[PDB]
Amino acid sequence: HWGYGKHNGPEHWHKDFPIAKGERQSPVDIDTHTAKYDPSLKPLSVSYDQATSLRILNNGHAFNVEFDDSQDKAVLKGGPLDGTYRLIQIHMHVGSLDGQGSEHTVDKKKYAAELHLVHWNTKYGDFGKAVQQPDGLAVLGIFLKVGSAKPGLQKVVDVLDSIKTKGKSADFTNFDPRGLLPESLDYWTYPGSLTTPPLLECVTWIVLKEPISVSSEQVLKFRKLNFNGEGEPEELMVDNWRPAQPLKNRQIKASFK
Ligand SMILES: [Cu+2]
Known part of the structure; x- marks a missing residue:
């Protein structure tokens, strides 16, 4: 199996999933001084x-808000994308300390957390088929930094008690994901992969420059989930992030100067 522990953590993943040592793995460090601004985007x-939205669940790796992607209801397009990408899932990578938690880093700097809004290319029929394509997914990454409470996140915060352990799920309809976005849509983009097994290199990454803020209380609550199943030794769901991977010969482009 796999997890974020010493014996099944990121450093062990390549034995079950060889692609963990591939040419376009995620996340990566974003060196703001070498990223190429591209006004053609x-x-x-x-x-x-x-x-x-449909449900929210704790799969032992993170909390996940699932959406109805049978139609073009919540979509992502434009930017470096060709066609339409449907939102299917939103989950969070969080740290144990405010100075860590994000998967992508900016000039080596790590944020307290990183939200990943997963979308898939409609020209492929469904998510399962899309992950098998180099351009099958578009994942929106949003950094979290401590500040004023974020209303859009309080919706999630308010339900965390119900999905504390692995396998727990709850109804989560009428959730507006627009509430998870910062003011600016400026972003960095590069070709990458899923950051958890199977680690398929099928995603066009779009990482927003502007992190959203969350209150200390909110962050504390997001660290109260468990990796374990109910009844087993309690293992706080913290530091469920994959460290930066070698950029290799990939170019990170900026949508702003
Ligand atoms: Cu993720």
């Missing part, structure tokens, strides 16, 4: 108006 289009 069309603007990032986020259309979450009729988004329809």
